Design a protein around this ligand. Structure first.
Ligand SMILES: *[B]([O])([O])[C]([C][C]([C])[C])[N]C(=O)[C]([C]C1=[C][C]=[C][C]=[C]1)[N]C(=O)C1=[C]N=[C][C]=N1
Ligand SMILES: *[B]([O])([O])[C]([C][C]([C])[C])[N]C(=O)[C]([C]C1=[C][C]=[C][C]=[C]1)[N]C(=O)C1=[C]N=[C][C]=N1
Ligand SMILES: *[B]([O])([O])[C]([C][C]([C])[C])[N]C(=O)[C]([C]C1=[C][C]=[C][C]=[C]1)[N]C(=O)C1=[C]N=[C][C]=N1
Ligand SMILES: *[B]([O])([O])[C]([C][C]([C])[C])[N]C(=O)[C]([C]C1=[C][C]=[C][C]=[C]1)[N]C(=O)C1=[C]N=[C][C]=N1
Ligand SMILES: [Cl-]
Ligand SMILES: [Cl-]
Ligand SMILES: [Mg+2]
Ligand SMILES: [Mg+2]
Ligand SMILES: [Mg+2]
Ligand SMILES: [Mg+2]
Ligand SMILES: [Mg+2]
Lengths: 195, 196, 233, 204, 222, 212, 226, 195, 196
């Protein structure tokens, strides 16, 4: 799929992902949720080749949920991101690699810190204050470089995110039909229904 | 194709097979590859039939016009005209030509003109796909100042082997004798040259 | 997948009233080089079948070994190996046809065209074709390679349909085959003068003729042909 | 990519007793997209009729070109061009673009005004004349048209019977071709009257 | 490079009647511009009152027919000599074809017979196994020449009743076996005229409750 | 090909065309592009005929096995996911499929899943699939409401296929209608485009461009 | 395509089949492949049909002007030379494969021409996709000192071999005989061994079977007086 | 460029053309007028390869304006469309062809009839009641087939045009930044400033 | 490469040049292409040096193991083992091998195995790039039941011509004589064979 963004503020991680699904010449859907909850305090957004994206996301989801049940314990965002990276690093030298890029946003309940990880289909992991995949970063990183401050509130983070989406809607050729925004903090994951 | 020209005591003899092929189909089994550009200046043709005919026709025209103005041309002159056409149009031509002729002053002469358009004056010359199989034989058996009968046997035996091994060569062995006496055509059929 | 290296040209054949005739020249070509001049490409199987093979010679020799091995295997625990349970032309063909199609299906073909000529137990004439693709067909006359283009037309003038088979004698049929071989020598640049011919008759059995030559050739008219158009001398 | 099947369409012609018939479909498209259902492919210069299939820009260009040439012919000759003569003019005009050809499949139909003899002819894109006694076909459903004409046709049909034969040949051939259809026109041509009939057909 | 596929030409035609079915096919076999055989049977009796033909690449065609005949044999062994119905044969053939989805049998398959109500039936397949019951189908090289003729003369397409002018269609009256054979012969005669790979002979297999009958007709040999 | 399906008050409408082509050659006008998986499930077919036919009748076998094992009707979600997981195994091999899995269950209500040979699986209210999908979308989007009568919804689906049959060269033949409700699907006849076009033109006053 | 040429006692004969094909389809069943360059110089053509016709017309036209200029009947070697030089110039792209024959004051002549411009001399020749089937017949039955009747028979038999055995050839046999001191006789459809049989059914439709939308008279006449 | 539409109603011709100009990844402009007035009662819209479009349109414009001055007379829409077609038909066999598709909307003052012509870069002309170039027709022709009526008013034509643009904005992947609409009737050419 | 094997009255003689080339660079001018797979069964190698060495090594292993079990193998048996390797691995090999050996029962025998993997029993055999240039010479000059001295001269003269014309052939002419008497190695230097 197309645009997926992420920003880590003072006390939360905010993920924004486009709603459009396009096959060729037509927009088949304009309300698609490009994300999966891996654990109560960990959310993963994704974008890449058709089919591979969902298949990979649900495969990761199943593995983390299996871990949670087995140990009666939630893995840290850092631990989940490492597991995901290794799967993609394994995948890139397979017969047919997973063509999927992901952002992992989580709140570490031990350290009481939000964490945002950016991983591409090669298995290239980086921890960041803000991140993006595809052509999104080409527009949004300049704004975030200017405006981001690391002690921002969640409300300030959403305003800065609106400024990013406005710029994308102005300068990107593709109509991505807006974004679904989700917040990850100490209380868990919730969706902003009006954006 | 198997073609050759050989100088000897009384002059020069040209020799050739008669096979023309489109792939493995023999389009003509009785082809005449020994062609006349002047009274006592002939050539052997190998490569593209269209190219070598077009070239030979142009040369015959040039030498006919040369003769009208300056009298009988030398064999060297004829070879130069062939070269000029083959060299300057090397990119678009596939032609391997042997030029042979008889003067009274220079006697028998042979010039070979391979693909590039270079000229090589030789005592004898061999060319065509079938020539590869008789380099050994011809080098071992060629002598200078042979007789007419010896030279005919040399060409007959040589082309017989070339025909035997090369699929692109076959049919009858045509020959053309160039001496002071005149121009003599010879032909040798499979039954004769195969039993050699 | 490969490319053929040492190759054999046309195999030609036809039916007649009491049996079948098949022929093929004794050349093994290496591209344009006429490398091997003593290659037998008709391989008899028992006293009722002859398999004629064209194409890659290394694959021919492999097939030759398979047939040799087939005769050995058929004799095992078979008291009627030289009688009721002897190898039929139809059995030999179907086996080859199976192998050819299996090999093309593994993308590793036997680079050949094969004609199985023979006479069955009930006296019926057998003549069927198979090639590297596993394609099979039967006809009163069959030929491979250049033979298909030049021999078939000549042989079809003798036997044009099924009803022409009883009306065709062995002398007339052999005459047509020998003429076809001459025509192929005139016109096929990868053929030789020397060839082998085989007759399988329901009465007189298998007659295998070796060291035959193309004869009665017309070349004399060549002397009159001069130049390529305008030349007179 | 293939110029002769971008726009699509078909033409068919037939001879009858003291008459000829020429017919065509009305479709113009851009590959799968149907654009126009009024794109007629039959033109006439005097009493000589010309149908043209293939690339539509060339169909238009050649019509304009032959109108140009037949008009000059008439001014100089002081008479209308005949089918036999026009056939040669089409062949000449196409072959002059031997190595940069118009991607078309022309079909000539008409009756010679002096002899009264019915005449039809077809061409390839570079000028070759096919002068058939029975029928001529052209376009993206030429295979289909050959099959219909070869089975339905019989010689010496009366004008009103010939109409039914050619109409059924076109309609059923068009219905087996994705790039043909969207309407059809049939011309019935006699020595001094010509009737034009639009056919009702399936619009898919 | 080795090309495992070839084209043996030919053309086949199936027509379903009210209580009968025919499957026809020319007897010519070719490669490129040469004739291999003027009489090489292409339509086969496969048992259980079913006829079959697999037109296109003959090696694949023979292989498929051979495997289906085999399937009929093992159907009898495994299910107490039960008659294989035409619909069951069709589904079985789909699986034979799709089994080689990624290295296909390069053929157009048609089978004909009677359904379980005794009515005529024809089934048509593409190379990779998609199938559909039909009243009428031509397959192979000259299929594009024959099908339009059959749309017109079997299903009365684009035909209406005189006087009404396009309002009332021509009624779909049933065709006898004698009437169908006429249409088959004309289809192949017409195809032979305009298609170089069609000719030599025409072999028709007729299927009724009484069994399988054969008819042969000469075609032009040029 | 043009196939569509949409959710509404009275359940689901499924409508498809009937044409099959090999290049420009019209191979068939009588193709069944809807598959009766069971009395409650329908599958549409677009792309490769064989791929769609084979794997959708296979899907029906898997659904039958599910309800034999689980003593319960399979969910539309589960049925669609069996097919999407299967084609995903074959991804890259060259399968060509565009399908809607349509059904109703008590727990889900009327549900439509778009399933595709690239592995895409999407739940949604409206879908159009095939070479003529854009033409069908035009009519559907401008006339769609949740509050449509079974009679009006059926006509809209029929009309949207007709629109595409007209313009798209690789769509046509006839229209097959299905209506999926609480108590299963109901077939609503084969409608020849050759007769339907002129009927709709006259009664509706549409297609004023074409002459009749 | 099957085209042949055969020399005989007092002249030369050429022959051809009548099938034209676009791919596997027959475009014309009774195509005319024997072209007249001049009254007593005819040639048969194989390959691209527009090319054989065009190149024959052009050379035939220039031969006519040459004959009028020189006050002499045209020669076959002139037609040969003009054809080969034209074809060579176009480096094979003009796909014309010709058998050129004729009689002139020098005598009777028979030549072949290929698209790249190469010429060959012979007593018997054949060109086209059915040349192998025809050449097989010629190589089996040709002899020196053939009569007129024998040469026509041999030529037509060679074409038949093409008609029956080559899928690129079919339908009828056209012949043209060119004897010394006589008019050239052009025998169109000399043999007709491929007449279609009567159809089983008549497909004449009842009048009114086709649906019509509009009718109108087409004005083919000029603008009228008064 | 992208989307250009045309519709001929009772007494006028309406042309709608997108405002976006995209070079690669960015929308450089969102207010571009993809049309040129050829004569007081003839308007031409255009879309194709960058540069070629404007160069061709202005070249045609200059030629028609030259004709108008020379003859003190306005050419009929039919005459202008034929001139344009011939230029494109000439162009397609040139060293470097004009890669331009056009719609020509004009009001013929002699016949008192609106006329719409669709011409592609090959020189393929057709007169139509409604037309489009590129992927636009794939969406809009179905709506126009249903809704169009030959005797619509100009206001009804604009409403039907809004329904076309709404469908394009819903189903097309590219954001074409709306359309500029222009009406051609007996009184000349005018722009609808609010659409 | 120029290699040949010739049967004669007392047995068989193998002959070869000594040139190994990487393009136009002579990587080895003193190569030994006559290699031993058994006491009196040798072979001539042409084509890939790696392939023919690998094959020859495997054959020597097979015949060594054959000898331990079944006694001395025939030359036909050795040729069959070569064939089996060359045929079954035809797609991956570039090897043109001549097998020659001496039995007491069968005397001198020669088997040639070209690229395809086919086997051909012959009175004499020639192979390698340089063999093309001596088909004519060898066919004209070969006789059956020659003497040892005559056969050495035949091979020496033949390979001399092959070397003269083929760039891929050169250096010394190695030979190996196989008779009842035993195994004799011969070498002939450029100064000797060039003046022939
Ligand atoms: B000979 O084989 O080189 C021969 C000499 C020619 C002057 C008659 N050439 C040909 O036969 C060529 C093909 C060729 C073979 C080998 C090397 C180079 C070229 N044939 C033709 O040019 C030809 C074939 N068919 C029709 C017309 N021309
Ligand atoms: B539809 O156009 O997608 C249609 C649906 C199919 C289930 C019958 N597909 C086809 O007609 C395809 C070709 C095709 C055309 C356009 C887009 C995609 C595919 N045809 C076939 O699969 C086919 C099957 N058997 C015979 C001929 N063609
Ligand atoms: B013959 O088969 O060579 C024949 C001789 C011709 C001069 C009448 N040739 C053709 O019929 C050619 C074959 C061909 C096909 C495709 C490209 C080139 C040549 N056919 C035509 O020239 C032809 C085909 N369709 C319409 C008109 N002409
Ligand atoms: B001979 O030239 O064929 C020779 C025989 C070999 C067994 C010593 N082969 C080579 O010299 C080959 C190249 C070659 C030349 C001509 C035909 C085929 C192959 N050389 C090598 O294999 C080689 C070259 N450099 C390093 C290692 N190996
Ligand atoms: Cl020549
Ligand atoms: Cl080594
Ligand atoms: Mg990264
Ligand atoms: Mg599954
Ligand atoms: Mg359509
Ligand atoms: Mg024929
Ligand atoms: Mg050297």
């Amino acid at each position: 799929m197309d645009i997926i963004l992420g920003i880590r503020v003072q006390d939360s991680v905010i993920l924004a992902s486009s709603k459009a699904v396009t096959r060729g010449i037509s927009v088949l859907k304009d309300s698609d949720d490009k994300t999966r909850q891996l654990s109560p305090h960990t959310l993963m957004s994704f974008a890449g080749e058709a089919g591979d994206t969902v298949q990979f996301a649900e495969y990761i989801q199943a593995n983390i949920q299996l871990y949670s049940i087995r140990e009666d314990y939630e893995l840290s965002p850092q631990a989940v991101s490492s597991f995901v990276r290794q799967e993609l690093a394994k995948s890139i030298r397979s017969r047919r690699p997973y063509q999927v890029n992901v952002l992992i946003g989580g709140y570490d309940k031990k350290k009481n810190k939000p964490e945002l990880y950016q991983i591409d289909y090669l298995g290239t992991k980086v921890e960041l204050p803000y991140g993006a995949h595809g052509y999104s970063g080409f527009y949004t990183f300049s704004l975030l470089d200017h405006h981001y401050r690391p002690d921002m509130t969640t409300e300030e983070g959403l305003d800065l995110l609106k400024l990013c989406v406005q710029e994308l809607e102005k300068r990107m050729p593709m109509d991505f039909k807006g974004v679904i925004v989700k917040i990850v903090d100490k209380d868990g994951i919730r969706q902003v229904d009006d954006f | 194709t198997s073609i050759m020209a050989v100088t000897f005591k009384d002059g020069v003899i040209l020799g050739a097979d008669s096979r023309t092929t489109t792939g493995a189909y023999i389009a003509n089994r009785v082809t005449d590859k020994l062609t006349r550009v002047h009274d006592k200046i002939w050539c052997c043709r190998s490569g593209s039939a269209a190219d070598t005919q077009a070239i030979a026709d142009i040369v015959q025209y040039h030498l006919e016009l040369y003769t009208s103005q300056y009298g009988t041309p030398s064999t060297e002159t004829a070879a130069s005209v062939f070269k000029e056409l083959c060299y300057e149009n090397k990119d678009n031509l596939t032609a391997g030509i042997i030029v042979a002729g008889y003067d009274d002053k220079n006697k028998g002469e042979v010039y070979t003109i391979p693909l590039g358009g270079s000229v090589h004056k030789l005592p004898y010359a061999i060319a065509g796909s079938g020539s590869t199989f008789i380099y050994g034989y011809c080098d071992k058996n060629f002598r200078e100042n042979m007789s007419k009968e010896e030279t005919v046997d040399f060409i007959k035996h040589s082309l017989s082997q070339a025909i035997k091994w090369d699929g692109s060569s076959g049919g009858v062995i045509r020959m053309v004798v160039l001496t002071a006496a005149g121009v003599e055509r010879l032909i040798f059929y499979p039954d004769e040259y195969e039993q050699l | 997948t490969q490319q053929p290296i040492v190759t054999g040209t046309s195999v030609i054949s036809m039916k007649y009233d009491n049996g079948v005739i098949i022929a093929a020249d004794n050349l093994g070509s290496y591209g344009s080089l006429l490398r091997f001049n003593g290659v037998e490409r008709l391989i008899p199987v028992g006293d009722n079948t002859v398999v004629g093979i064209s194409g890659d010679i290394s694959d021919m020799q492999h097939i030759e070994r398979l047939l040799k091995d087939l005769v050995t295997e058929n004799a095992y625990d078979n008291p009627l190996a030289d009688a009721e349970e002897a190898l039929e032309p139809s059995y030999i063909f179907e086996y080859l046809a199976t192998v050819m199609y299996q090999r093309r299906s593994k993308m590793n073909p036997l680079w050949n065209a094969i004609i199985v000529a023979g006479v069955q137990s009930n006296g019926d004439q057998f003549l069927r074709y198979v090639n590297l693709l596993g394609v099979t067909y039967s006809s009163p006359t069959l030929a491979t390679g250049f033979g298909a283009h030049m021999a078939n037309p000549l042989l079809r003038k003798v036997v044009d349909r099924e009803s022409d088979i009883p009306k065709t004698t062995v002398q007339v049929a052999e005459e047509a085959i020998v003429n076809a071989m001459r025509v192929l020598y005139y016109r096929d640049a990868r053929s030789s003068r020397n060839f082998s011919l085989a007759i399988i008759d329901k009465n007189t059995g298998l007659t295998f003729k070796k060291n035959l030559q193309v004869e009665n050739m017309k070349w004399d008219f060549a002397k009159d042909i001069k130049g390529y158009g305008t030349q007179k001398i | 990519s293939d110029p002769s099947s971008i726009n699509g369409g078909i033409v068919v012609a037939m001879t009858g007793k003291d008459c000829v018939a020429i017919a065509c479909d009305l479709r113009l498209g851009s590959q799968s997209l149907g654009v126009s259902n009024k794109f007629e492919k039959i033109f006439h210069y005097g009493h000589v009729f010309l149908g043209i299939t293939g690339l539509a820009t060339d169909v238009t260009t050649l019509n304009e070109m032959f109108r140009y040439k037949t008009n000059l012919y008439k001014l100089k000759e002081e008479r209308a061009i005949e089918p036999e003569t026009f056939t040669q003019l089409v062949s000449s005009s196409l072959y002059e673009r031997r190595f940069g050809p118009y991607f078309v499949g022309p079909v000539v139909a008409g009756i010679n005004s002096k002899s009264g003899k019915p005449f039809i002819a077809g061409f390839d894109l570079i000028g070759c004349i096919d002068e058939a006694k029975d029928f001529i076909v052209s376009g993206t459903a030429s295979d289909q048209l050959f099959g219909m004409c070869e089975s339905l046709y019989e010689p010496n049909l009366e004008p009103e019977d010939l109409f039914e034969t050619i109409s059924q040949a076109l309609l059923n051939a068009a219905d087996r071709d994705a790039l043909s259809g969207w309407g059809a026109v049939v011309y019935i041509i006699k020595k001094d009257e010509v009737v034009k009939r639009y056919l009702k057909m399936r619009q898919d | 490079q080795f090309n495992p596929y070839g084209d043996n030409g030919g053309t086949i035609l199936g027509i379903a009647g009210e209580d009968f079915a025919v499957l026809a096919g020319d007897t010519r076999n070719i490669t490129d511009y040469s004739i291999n055989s003027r009489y090489e049977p292409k339509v086969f009796d496969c048992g259980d009152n079913i006829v079959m033909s697999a037109n296109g690449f003959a090696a694949d065609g023979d292989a498929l027919v051979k495997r289906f005949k085999n399937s009929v044999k093992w159907y009898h062994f495994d299910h107490n000599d039960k008659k294989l119905s035409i619909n069951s044969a069709a589904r079985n053939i789909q699986h034979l074809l799709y089994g080689k989805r990624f290295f296909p049998y390069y053929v157009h398959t048609i089978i004909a017979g009677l359904d379980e109500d005794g009515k005529g039936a024809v089934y048509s397949f593409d190379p990779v196994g998609s199938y559909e019951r039909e009243q009428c189908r031509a397959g192979g090289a000259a299929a594009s020449l024959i099908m339009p003729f059959l749309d017109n003369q079997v299903n009365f397409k684009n035909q209406y009743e005189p006087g009404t002018n396009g309002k009332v269609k021509k009624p779909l009256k049933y065709l006898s076996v004698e009437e169908v054979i006429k249409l088959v012969r004309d289809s192949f005669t017409s195809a032979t005229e305009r298609h170089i790979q069609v000719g030599d002979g025409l072999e028709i297999l007729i299927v009724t409750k009484d069994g399988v009958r054969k008819e042969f007709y000469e075609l032009k040999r040029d | 090909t043009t196939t569509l399906a949409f959710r509404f008050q009275g359940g689901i409408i499924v409508a498809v065309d009937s044409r099959a082509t090999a290049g420009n050659w019209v191979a068939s006008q009588t193709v069944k592009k809807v598959i009766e998986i069971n009395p409650f499930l329908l599958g549409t077919a677009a792309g490769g005929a064989a791929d769609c036919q084979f794997w959708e009748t296979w899907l029906g076998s898997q659904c039958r096995l599910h309800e034999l094992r689980e003593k319960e009707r399979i969910s539309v979600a589960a049925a669609s996911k069996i097919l999407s997981n299967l084609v995903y195994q074959y991804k890259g091999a060259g399968l060509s499929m565009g399908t809607m899995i349509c059904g109703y269950t008590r727990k889900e209500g009327p549900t439509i899943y778009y399933v595709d040979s690239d592995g895409t699986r999407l739940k949604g209210d409206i879908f159009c699939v095939g070479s003529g999908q854009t033409f069908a979308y035009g009519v559907l989007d401008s006339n769609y409401k949740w509050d449509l009568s079974v009679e009006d919804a059926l006509y809209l689906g029929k009309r949207s296929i007709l629109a595409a049959a007209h313009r798209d060269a690789y769509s046509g033949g006839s229209v097959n209608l299905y209506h999926v409700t609480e108590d299963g699907w109901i077939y609503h006849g084969n409608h020849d485009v050759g007769e339907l076009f002129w009927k709709v033109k006259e009664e509706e006053g549409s297609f004023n461009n074409v002459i009749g | 395509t099957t085209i042949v040429g055969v020399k005989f006692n007092n002249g030369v004969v050429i022959a051809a089949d009548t099938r034209s094909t676009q791919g596997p389809i027959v475009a014309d069943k009774n195509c005319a492949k024997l072209h007249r360059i001049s009254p007593k110089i005819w040639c048969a053509g194989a390959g691209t049909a527009a090319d054989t016709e065009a190149v024959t017309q052009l050379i035939g036209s220039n031969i006519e002007l040459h004959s009028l200029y020189t006050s002499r009947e045209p020669r076959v070697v002139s037609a040969l030379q003009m054809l080969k030089q034209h074809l060579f110039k176009y480096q094979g792209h003009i796909g014309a494969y010709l058998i050129v024959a004729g009689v002139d004051p020098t005598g009777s002549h028979l030549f072949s021409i290929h698209a790249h411009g190469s010429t060959d001399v012979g007593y018997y020749l054949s060109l086209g996709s059915g040349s192998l089937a025809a050449m097989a017949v010629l190589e089996s039955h040709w002899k020196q000192d053939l009569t007129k009747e024998e040469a026509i028979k041999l030529a037509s038999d060679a074409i038949q071999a093409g008609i029956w055995n080559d899928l690129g050839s079919g339908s009828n046999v056209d012949v043209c005989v060119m004897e010394i001191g006589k008019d050239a006789e052009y025998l169109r459809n000399y043999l007709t061994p491929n007449v279609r049989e009567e159809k089983q059914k008549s497909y004449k439709f009842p009048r009114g079977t086709t649906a019509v939308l509009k009718e109108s008279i087409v004005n083919i006449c000029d603008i009228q007086e008064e």
